[PDB]
């Protein structure tokens, strides 16, 4: 697990990680994925190990496809470390820009309510829902109806990145 100096340097410049951290993450990545290429089954396995009695298939597939920047069916280390940099160390706006890419499942530049429901449902399928009374059931649908309407300031049935990024931000 020896990363070529130029590569380390470039990945360090492109992320929030120090050169030491990049090399440490590489060493762990190669230990877990000796070929340097994480496939979709291995990615879902990680999440099943987190939630062995939820169903992580949908969430893992959605996130894998966003992480797989060159869409070759594999997460290479450059994709691994850049995905980790943004999702773990980005500013709030950078993290929400990444999430917008995840939620915009058809890549048309907007989040529609069906897309928000797909991600939210995927999250509940994996991690579960909060137990409530049958009369106050924690359904993805009613949660999405609330948040989406709140974000859709111009009520055109679609969310721009601007509308999405302002969703928890206080004014």
């Amino acid at each position: 697990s020896k990363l070529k100096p130029e590569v380390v340097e470039e990945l360090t410049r492109k992320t929030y990680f120090t050169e030491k951290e990049v090399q440490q993450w590489y060493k762990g990545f190669i230990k877990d994925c000796p070929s340097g290429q994480l496939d979709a089954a291995g990615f879902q396995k990680i999440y099943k190990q987190f939630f062995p009695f939820g169903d992580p298939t949908k969430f893992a597939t959605f996130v894998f496809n966003v992480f797989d920047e060159n869409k070759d069916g594999r997460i290479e280390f450059s994709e691994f470390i850049q995905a980790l940099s943004v999702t773990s160390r980005g500013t709030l706006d950078e993290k929400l820009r990444w999430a917008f890419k995840l939620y915009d499942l058809d890549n048309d530049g907007y989040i529609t309510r069906n897309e928000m429901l797909d991600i939210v449902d995927a999250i509940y399928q994996m991690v579960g829902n909060t137990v409530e009374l049958p009369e106050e059931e924690n359904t993805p649908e009613k949660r999405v109806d609330r948040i989406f309407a709140m974000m859709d300031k111009n009520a055109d049935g679609k969310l721009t990145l601007q509308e999405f990024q302002e969703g928890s931000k206080a004014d």
Binding site: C33, T130, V144
Partner: peptide, 28 residues
């Protein structure tokens, strides 16, 4: 109790946190 960050489900932050935790497990 309820997981801390599931209040952000649908806002983007929950998906981001869960994505990061999976990557971290993949590198440890």
């Amino acid at each position: 109790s309820v997981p801390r960050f599931i209040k952000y489900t649908g806002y983007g932050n929950a998906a981001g946190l869960l994505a990061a935790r999976g990557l971290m497990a993949g590198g440890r």
